[PDB]
Amino acid sequence: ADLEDNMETLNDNLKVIEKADNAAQVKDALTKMRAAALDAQKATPPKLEDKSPDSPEMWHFRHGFDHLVGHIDDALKLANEGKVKEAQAAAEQLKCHCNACHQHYR
Amino acid sequence: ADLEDNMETLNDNLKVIEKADNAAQVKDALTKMRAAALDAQKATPPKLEDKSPDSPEMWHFRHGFDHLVGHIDDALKLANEGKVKEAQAAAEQLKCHCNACHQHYR
Ligand code: HEC
Ligand code: HEC
Ligand code: NI
């Protein structure tokens, strides 16, 4: 899917995690976030269209998703050990990373 | 140093990074910040003084500094590599993580 679709998937599953009742629910939402981040990592954002595909700004954009995926993996590790509160807390650590990419590339 | 002093160091050295013009200064301030964060991690904050150190909240508090330290290291790598503007921008994005912890425990 394209970038706005994947961002909607990111945003909607954050709320699913916030309201989750067990760690397996958090797990399911996080795996869907993980796939959406990796799919978005293949897009070219508008504010970098007129830029070389190999530009350092393109690689910083792509590495922003690598960082986010690492944090999603960190939260998945807690969710798969049944720690619903702790994986929920880890998922809200994502929000600042969301905003840091937006500040430069949205 | 006590918790409040370490916060003073983090707050004042963020502004030092803002006004610096060369990597040597950025490195110096990021280094003071990194030690202050690791020192603050060992404290018990007043809004948690009647919890136990193994309480979730006390572990969430600790984990916030682990995460902040890693992002300081990322900015130190940029200033060791001599990219002053990028390191200054990485340091500005620390504020979101400051605020996230503050909204819970400040
Ligand atoms: C870069 C590394 C990003 C990260 C990490 C996240 N997002 Fe993002 N987001 C990014 C761009 C470039 C854009 C604009 C894309 C465009 O073509 O307009 C966005 C946009 C959003 C939006 C608005 C959706 C829309 O239809 O325009 C939302 C709601 C959004 N992003 C949410 C979001 C969340 C919750 C993130 C982390 C969990 C996140 N984004 C990360 C780039 C990047
Ligand atoms: C938790 C993981 C925190 C992180 C990360 C940061 N801060 Fe912090 N801050 C925290 C607490 C619990 C408190 C209250 C301490 C107390 O004893 O009252 C604070 C306080 C501050 C203050 C005000 C200090 C004072 O005047 O008493 C400042 C200016 C401040 N913090 C700055 C700051 C900055 C710039 C941070 C990121 C670089 C940062 N803090 C991170 C908890 C946490
Ligand atoms: Ni991070």
Count of Cβ atoms closer than 10 Å to residue B51 Cβ: 14
* DSSP per position, A15-56: HHHHT-SSHHHHHHHHHHHHHHHHHHTTS--GGGTTS-TTSH
Q: Domain residues for A100?
A: 1-106
List the structure tokens of A73.
């993996």
* Number of domains, chain B: 1
**CB distance from A24 to chain B under 8 Å?**
no
**Which residues contact residue B96 at a Cβ distance below 8 angstroms, ignoring those fewer than 6 apart?**
A96, A99, A100
> How far apart are the C-alpha atoms of B94 and A100, rounded to whole Å?
9
Measured between alpha carbons, how far is residue A84 from residues A10, A68, B102 in Å? 19, 20, 23
**CB distance from A95 to chain B under 8 Å?**
yes
Query: Cβ contacts (< 8 Å) between A93 and chain B: which residues?
Result: 67, 100
> How far apart are the C-alpha atoms of A83 and B22, rounded to whole Å?
45
Tokens 């690598």 locate to: A66
Report how this structure was experimentally obtained: X-ray
Count of A-B CB contacts under 8 Å:
19
Sequence letter at residue A3: L
Interchain CB distance below 8 Å, B100 and A85 = no
Pair A69, A35: CB distance under 8 Å: no
Count of Cβ atoms closer than 10 Å to residue B76 Cβ: 19
